[PDB]
Design an enzyme around this catalytic site. Structure first.
Site: not given
Ligand SMILES: Nc1ncnc2c1ncn2[C@@H]1O[C@H](COP(=O)(O)OP(=O)(O)OP(=O)(O)O)[C@@H](O)[C@H]1O
Ligand SMILES: Nc1ncnc2c1ncn2[C@@H]1O[C@H](COP(=O)(O)OP(=O)(O)OP(=O)(O)O)[C@@H](O)[C@H]1O
Ligand SMILES: Nc1ncnc2c1ncn2[C@@H]1O[C@H](COP(=O)(O)OP(=O)(O)O)[C@@H](O)[C@H]1O
Ligand SMILES: [Mg+2]
Ligand SMILES: [Mg+2]
Lengths: 137, 117, 467, 476, 90, 464, 137
Positions: F189, G76, G101-103
């Site tokens: 990130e 993530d 899911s941050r992706v």
């Protein structure tokens, strides 16, 4: 319970390392060694017996505290007494569902075993049904 | 399914699903009562009570406690009985007929003892 | 030699080195001097431990601010001792026996060590004789015992001290004997108020007041109860007086013991309490007792930390009592005074063989109705009463009226409300609650039962409400 | 002079070798003008709690005695000043001319050195003065969740003492001490701004231990403020002390105790946390005439979490003080400000310290609100009762920084407890009230003067008040 | 077992709240067109179930606060026991 | 005068110095790990003076490969970070090292990261409002100049775009600069943010300071102070307004707890460090307005177990001036920024601070939106037909108001070609007053999506 | 979870200070150092990648326990599996309402991105409406 507290006081004063609720490691051993001397001797040793009636005080009906857990795991059954049952008029305030004798019918005369063989299970099922059918019309 | 076979696995999964739904509905039944359930949920609750009782069994080692002699149920009979139970084939018998018995013959005998059939 | 010297100072705990052969005995009172101007004083230390190498660990009765290492410590040869006799009556003392309202008073009295053994077991005799108070709830459900041990448990601000004042009013005023009040770790202004109130009521001349209050070191808060009990024991054992002993608050004695235990380097027990919690409570409480032919009626307020009745201090206190009035925050929130928990409170003489079959039957019926009402709170909180059976709705209305009628306008509550208190004879209480449990007042509105006395009060209040 | 040496330092604790003649709780000077308090004296060393910039303490530094047990300078010169817990000015206004020094751990007046609280301390808050009146020498806990207006209540109370100050009479004046423990520096600055705008800094002292301070200062600040107040109290003056807030002092003391490896108990607090607060608040007292008749009124503030007044520190302080004002977040968020809760709020010793007129007006009012809350949560009489309760709830609403004089409060409560608000709409109850009050001050101000002088509302003045109300209402 | 009991109660209260909110909406619909009707026997069902949903929400809130107090207290007590053992072995 | 390693226990290193050369507390010491695979220069930070010339230090890098007895050099100062305009557009770690260009900024002026807050008399005694130009923030949750804003919301709610928007507005409207503090920053990130800010062309306006997740607790503890030191230089020396982003502040608290445990300190309630409040106060009191200039902070706050009474959020919220909650529901409706107007709050939305008219209009908007939320369930399950006519009027008005809270953001120009808007506070107040009064219910709903003030509203209404 | 337990065992046996749940002050570092090595490398370094699928076992579904909290913070995204869903027949027992899911869509092919666009909202609306199953008319 008071003996366990006294033993904890002694152990802490001797600066022995504490465990759960500051009890010494061997508190279970204290009670188990005490209560296994209650026995039914073989006929070769005279046939004598010692019956143990340990008493444990719980707080807020919390039978999951350390000492109650230890002693329950030691003895041949327990009679759970509850203040809710007591105040309701159930005296002795024995909670049938969770109270049990680990000897069973062998500790009863034949007539009693005959008339009471399924009483505890019947009462457990009755309490279950009474709870379940509380608001059934 | 691979080890125990499709039928056993299916019946076991159905029993688990019914019992899980009954667990989910228990608090509602406790407060609002059974009558506020949907018809399918009422049917499932009756079935689940019978299933949970039929999972109990009079054991050989328990006779010292109940005074009742124990029983043994073959696996095929167990699978068939619970398949019938999950379909509601025994919904008309009192739930007390299913308590602490062996197979389907014990069930029939206890039901007749209770005035059912 | 014969004189020690301060080696360590850790707050109100002092380590003192003495010459070989001159180590003071346990509980001996030693004296040291603080000379720094504002804080100049004579410290009284109490030997608590023999540390070895001719060292002792002592608990200071006064704050140790200004104490210096190496100052001389002298051993009095005896433990702390307090004046005893008829002369302590009408006077206020601190934990050391100094008279506060008249400094120097009582120095010529006989002086008794504050440490002593409890009565021999052969002298102990169970007490079963109702001490009627005129409070409906106490008289019906938790009858107090004359010559017995009563405790009032409760969390912060639920009414322990107002109820102690109530019992001083109801029991001490007409008392034919001696009274001892022990302020233990409580408000100093409450001590002043009690002193003035007793003076006004003329009960002071019969009362010895001993105060070690909040703004004291933990040693004084630990020992003041023993000092007051020593005066009470003199009255019990040397004069044959019936003795009333009020303690507010005994939890503060336990809490001071915990502070001191931490200062003494002992390993903590559960919840950080001293390992000797039960032992210390046992010593103190076992001294607080009646003996064959010699009566002490003791009433103790017991604070409950964080409203946690499972806390070890009140938990160990429970075993030492003949009657237990448990004040409830939930009851208090309803405006019910006294804020008694009628289900949690108990009395050893509430059994048919002692109070009679009718009193016992009525009490058991009240308790059963209240227990049933409590069991139904889960449903009521969500749905209210409209979903219950007819029997349960009837029981719930009965229980609400009963719980309100257990309230009372107390004598000591006038100061807060301007309403004079009421006294209800036990017979009228039994009759009234019999009628209540039977449904004879189901038509009267609930508020008619709130903060009143007997049946005449109920009639008048219900009439005022239109019923 | 005896000079010791730092033998180790860490986390606000230093250990000093030497200094044989050091006193328990003495102050010690470390280089850089740092100070410590000698807590533990053993054969080997002295354990000092550092009160100040601990990061400047180094092994091997020279430690000097001050020859003084823990103490702060005191005197009239502290009025209008902002100081840290050591008494050192932090307002940048020069030296403070101390009359003397006072040790911080002098014991409270004994049972025989006090007298019952009988003089009112007017907060200027209608809700408090009417329902939980505070007497001089009382300890009244202000307890509630964050952002519920606790500091506002205390600052308005300090502001209300301005008129009493202007009388010049030491038997009427109230000197104020505001103690900021763990508060944001900007909040302390805004409190000072408000006090300055109200003319309160003339008779107020601020003891500041902001959130950036080390634990020692936060732990010490209440005792510093209490000592400064006690110097006045023992000279026959009347003092109001605000502790904003004692939860932060308890946290700081817990931090110090844990850093000293003292075994903790409930909520990781040390066993003597109760002693910490109780000895502090015991020193707020009303003195007997033999000791000059002075008093110190305590207003400790406690911050609860989710309105949990049964937690450890709240119950400790409730069991120390003489009543509490419980500020609710629900009331506060509904615009009911101050957010006092009648069900919990009580004054244990304030009834005796409340003028006659206020007693007469507010008597029925208190119970009326307590019952109306439940009646609302739940016939023609009931509906009229609900309307009356809503009007009274609007009546007790008060803007910030606007304390009311006692006679004005009497008239304002009279408006609502005598049905004179039933005519006006609820949403106007405030404006009406305010306007009406101004009217009585513009003309017919004889009522205010009479109430102030006699401390009671006469029947003739009462009837004149009703006539003025009716004339104004027709004008309204 | 306190925290476990509190979590069980939270689950029960949440289910009750869901059912009562559904019933309140159904009653709203039926108004335009059993005994869960409040004081009706002693529209009404809609008000009663709205009240029950609000009561269940309040119960869930209070139970969650109690559960978080118990969770924090258990962490603190466990650490107290661990550190007490470590100190005694120091 | 150099010391030597005596004990190594994970990140805790004990170091012995000659009698008179003991380093001061918080001094940065340097040691060498020479083993080829793990070769590095360790930075240790003096945590305690153990006596007898020993100091206990926290290593800022893993100590694997460290050897007893190796030389330890005292730098004579605490951890010091480069300051100046040169740090903008570059990524740094908590120690001042440049990550995107190793060696960069070594010649800049260096400031110690341990500094006091402004002196009590130097503080502004009156709160001020930070006019952002965003309608929702300015009206419903005004930000405090020099205050702290908690930010909430999972992934996918426009959080990064909102951060970019605030960077844009502080740079172009206040002439200020930004410092991002990635506390416990995920490396993936951090890289994503670096690239995205470069793509947005806002990297030049911002200095990035990353204390990564895979670092020992010491750097994660100090990274917030490093970023704060850069911001403090910008405010106090360059006379600029600064926006300081902290993500996540809870990870600063937790790194403090880890360090406290590593140093043998007894944990406080719920296992946190005993000095939790003091550490948080030392950090947060440095974020203020002083001498006409301010640092304003937006801080992501994690709440353990959703328990707001937990010691970490409880300590953090003692310092928070506003709360912005970003809702997936609002985002899914295309309303950007996806600020949940009902959950968001501000402590200065009071008549005494923002004025009576602002307060009245904001409360009216809140009331309408709350009634709409209440009617939402009926709408969804029984249909909008069931609602009374007054309910339908309220639904229409509330839908228009909630769409008008949307705005075309500066940072949104890179996804939608259109540029952003800056609505003056007075314009927002009057526009929403009219909207509540019902002077635009006739206009189509889409007319309110992603526009600025009233001129844009009229233009888009006519374009439809 | 087992690795964290083993590291705690080692640390305690080495007398390193314990914290919450008796873990050492560097257990978070243990897992974060492990899991930051899973990365997608730039083209300058060959463009290789390592995808990590750490498994964490919760007790009574307490994701606020110390090690679950740490690993959730580190990763993530999370796939939360639940035994209640498993018993309901929902297998794999993923709680789509809390799993993330941050992706996100960057990890999907365009076709999946399109067909799966409405899935999340459809499932959320279904969960909201499930109470009204029997009142579908
Ligand atoms: N019978 C009563 N009638 C009316 N009010 C009462 C009554 N009993 C108590 N109160 C109110 O409750 C307050 C607290 O009562 P009391 O001091 O007896 O409590 P407590 O349990 O001793 O408190 P603490 O723990 O603070 O010492 C009293 O000051 C009074 O305000
Ligand atoms: N009577 C009132 N009328 C209107 N606003 C008020 C009133 N009292 C307080 N406020 C406002 O409410 C907010 C909270 O007030 P205050 O700072 O006194 O509360 P607090 O409980 O001490 O807060 P904190 O937790 O920040 O210390 C402030 O904006 C204050 O201006
Ligand atoms: N105002 C906006 N206009 C257009 N697209 C937006 C806007 N806000 C967010 N988005 C889109 O939504 C996605 C999520 O926004 P972002 O802030 O990156 O979420 P997060 O920061 O949680 O990863 C982005 O890819 C972005 O393209
Ligand atoms: Mg009391
Ligand atoms: Mg405040």
């Amino acid at each position: 319970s008071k003996q366990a507290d006294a033993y904890r006081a002694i152990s802490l004063l001797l600066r022995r390392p504490p465990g759960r609720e500051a009890f010494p490691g061997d508190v279970f051993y204290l009670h188990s060694r005490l209560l296994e001397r209650c026995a039914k001797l073989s006929d070769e040793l005279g046939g004598g017996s010692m019956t143990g009636l340990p008493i444990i005080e719980t707080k807020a009906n919390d039978i999951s505290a350390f000492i109650p857990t230890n002693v329950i795991s030691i003895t041949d059954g327990q009679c759970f007494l509850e203040s809710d049952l007591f105040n309701q008029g159930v005296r002795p305030a024995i909670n049938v569902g969770v109270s049990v004798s680990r000897v069973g019918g062998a500790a009863q005369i034949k007539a009693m075993k005959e008339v009471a063989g399924s009483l505890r299970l019947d009462l457990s099922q009755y309490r279950e049904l009474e709870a379940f059918a509380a608001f059934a019309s | 399914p691979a080890i125990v076979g499709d039928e056993h696995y299916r019946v076991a999964q159905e029993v688990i699903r019914i019992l899980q739904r009954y667990k989910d509905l228990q608090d509602i039944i406790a407060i609002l009562g059974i009558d506020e359930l949907s018809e399918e949920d009422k049917q499932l609750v009756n079935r689940a009570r019978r299933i949970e009782r039929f999972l109990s069994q009079n054991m050989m080692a328990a006779e010292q406690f109940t005074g009742q002699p124990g029983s043994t149920v073959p696996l095929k009979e167990t699978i068939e009985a619970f398949d019938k139970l999950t379909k509601g084939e025994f919904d008309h018998l009192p739930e007390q007929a299913f308590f602490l018995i062996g197979g389907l013959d014990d069930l029939a005998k206890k039901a007749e003892s209770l005035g059912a059939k | 030699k014969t004189a020690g010297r301060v080696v360590r100072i850790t707050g109100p705990v002092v380590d003192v080195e003495f010459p070989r052969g001159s180590v003071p005995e346990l509980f001996n009172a030693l004296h040291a001097e603080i000379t720094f101007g504002a804080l100049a004083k004579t410290l009284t230390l109490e030997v608590a431990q023999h540390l070895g190498d001719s060292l002792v660990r002592c608990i200071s009765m006064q704050p140790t601010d200004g104490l210096v290492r190496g100052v001389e410590v002298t051993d009095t040869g005896a433990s702390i001792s307090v004046p005893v006799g008829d002369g302590v009556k009408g006077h206020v003392f601190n934990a050391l026996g100094d008279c506060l309202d008249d400094p120097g008073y009582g120095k010529d009295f006989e002086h008794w060590s504050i440490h002593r053994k409890p009565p021999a077991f052969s002298d102990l005799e169970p007490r079963t004789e109702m001490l009627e108070t005129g409070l409906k709830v106490v008289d019906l459900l938790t009858p107090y015992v004359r010559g017995g041990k009563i405790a009032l448990f409760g969390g912060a601000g639920v009414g322990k001290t107002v109820l102690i004042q109530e019992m001083i009013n109801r029991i001490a005023r007409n008392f034919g004997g001696t009274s001892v009040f022990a302020g233990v770790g409580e408000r100093t202004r409450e001590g002043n108020d009690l002193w003035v109130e007793l003076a006004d009521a003329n009960v002071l001349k019969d009362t010895a007041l001993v105060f070690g209050q909040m703004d004291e070191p933990p040693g004084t808060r630990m020992r003041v109860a023993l000092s007051a009990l020593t005066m009470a024991e003199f009255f019990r054992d040397e004069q044959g007086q019936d003795v009333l002993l009020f303690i507010d608050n005994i939890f503060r004695f336990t809490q001071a013991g915990s502070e001191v235990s931490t200062l003494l380097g002992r390993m903590p027990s559960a919840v950080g309490y001293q390992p000797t919690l039960a032992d210390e409570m046992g010593e103190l409480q076992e001294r607080i007792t009646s003996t064959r032919g010699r009566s002490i009626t003791s009433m103790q307020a017991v604070y409950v930390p964080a409203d946690d009745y499972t806390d070890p201090a009140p938990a160990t206190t429970f075993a030492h009592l003949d009657a237990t009035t448990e004040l409830s925050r939930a009851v208090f929130s309803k405006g019910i005074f006294p804020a008694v928990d009628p289900l949690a409170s108990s009395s050893t003489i509430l059994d048919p063989a002692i109070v009679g079959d009718e009193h016992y039957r009525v009490a058991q019926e009240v308790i059963r109705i209240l227990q049933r009402y409590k069991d139904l709170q889960d449903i009521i909180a969500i749905l209210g009463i409209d979903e219950l059976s007819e029997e349960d709705k009837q029981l719930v209305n009965r229980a609400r009226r009963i719980e309100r009628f257990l309230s009372q306008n107390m004598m000591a509550a006038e100061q807060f409300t301007g309403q004079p208190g009421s006294t209800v004879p036990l017979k009228e209480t039994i009759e009234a609650f019999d009628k209540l449990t039977k449904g004879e007042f189901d038509h009267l509105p609930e508020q008619a039962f709130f903060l009143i006395g007997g049946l005449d009060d109920l009639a008048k209040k219900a009439e005022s409400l239109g019923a | 002079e005896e000079i010791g040496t730092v033998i180790d330092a860490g986390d606000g604790i230093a250990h000093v070798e030497g200094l044989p003649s050091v006193m328990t709780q003495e102050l010690l000077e470390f280089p850089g003008g740092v100070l410590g308090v000698a807590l533990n004296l053993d054969e080997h060393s002295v354990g000092a709690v550092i009160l100040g910039e601990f990061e400047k303490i180094e092994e091997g530094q020279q430690v000097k005695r001050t020859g003084e047990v823990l103490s702060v300078p005191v005197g009239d010169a502290f009025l209008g000043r902002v100081v840290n817990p050591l008494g050192q000015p932090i307002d940048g206004q020069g030296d403070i001319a101390a009359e003397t020094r006072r040790a911080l751990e002098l014991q409270a007046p004994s049972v025989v050195q006090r007298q019952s609280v009988s003089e009112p301390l007017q907060t200027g808050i209608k809700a408090i003065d009417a329902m939980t009146p505070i007497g001089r020498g009382q300890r009244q806990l202000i307890i509630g969740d964050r952002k519920t207006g606790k500091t506002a209540v205390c600052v308005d109370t300090i502001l209300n003492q301005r008129e009493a100050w202007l009388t010049g009479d030491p038997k009427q004046q109230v000197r104020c001490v505001y103690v900021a423990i763990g508060q944001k520096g900007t909040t302390i600055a805004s409190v000072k701004r408000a006090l300055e705008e109200g003319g309160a800094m003339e008779y107020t002292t601020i003891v500041a231990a902001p959130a950036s301070d080390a634990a020692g200062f936060k732990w010490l600040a209440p005792y510093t403020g209490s000592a400064i107040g006690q110097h006045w109290m023992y000279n026959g003056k009347h003092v109001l002390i605000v502790f904003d807030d004692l939860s932060k002092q308890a946290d700081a003391y817990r931090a110090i105790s844990l850093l000293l490896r003292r075994p903790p108990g409930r909520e990781a607090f040390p066993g003597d946390v109760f002693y910490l607060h109780s000895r502090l608040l015991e020193r707020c007292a009303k003195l007997s005439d033999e000791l000059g008749g002075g008093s110190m009124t305590g207003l400790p503030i406690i911050e609860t979490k989710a309105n949990d007044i049964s937690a450890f520190i709240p119950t400790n302080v409730i069991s120390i003080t003489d009543g509490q004002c419980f500020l609710e977040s629900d009331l506060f968020n509904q615009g009911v400000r101050p957010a006092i809760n009648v069900g919990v709020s009580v004054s244990r010793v304030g009834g005796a310290a409340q003028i006659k007129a206020m007693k007469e007006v507010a008597g029925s009012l208190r119970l009326d609100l307590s019952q109306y809350r439940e009646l609302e949560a739940f016939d023609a009489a009931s509906k009229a009762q609900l309307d009356r309760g809503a009007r009274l709830v609007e009546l007790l609403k008060q803007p910030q920084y606007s304390p009311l004089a006692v006679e004005e409060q009497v008239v304002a409560i009279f408006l609502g407890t005598q049905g004179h608000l039933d005519s006006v709409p609820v949403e106007d109850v405030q404006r009406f009230e305010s306007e009406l009050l101004e009217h009585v001050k513009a003309s017919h101000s004889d009522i205010f003067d009479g109430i102030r002088e006699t401390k009671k509302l006469s029947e003739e003045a009462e009837e004149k008040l009703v006539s003025v109300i009716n004339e104004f209402k027709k004008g309204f | 077992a306190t925290l476990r009991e509190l979590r069980g109660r939270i689950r029960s209260a949440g289910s009750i709240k869901k059912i009562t909110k559904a019933q309140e909406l159904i009653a709203t619909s039926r108004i335009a067109k059993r005994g869960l009707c409040g004081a009706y026997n002693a529209a009404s069902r809609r008000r009663a179930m709205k009240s029950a949903t609000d009561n269940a929400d309040d119960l869930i809130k209070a139970l969650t606060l109690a559960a978080n107090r118990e969770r924090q207290a258990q962490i603190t007590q466990e650490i107290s026991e661990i550190v007490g053992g470590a100190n005694a072995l120091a």
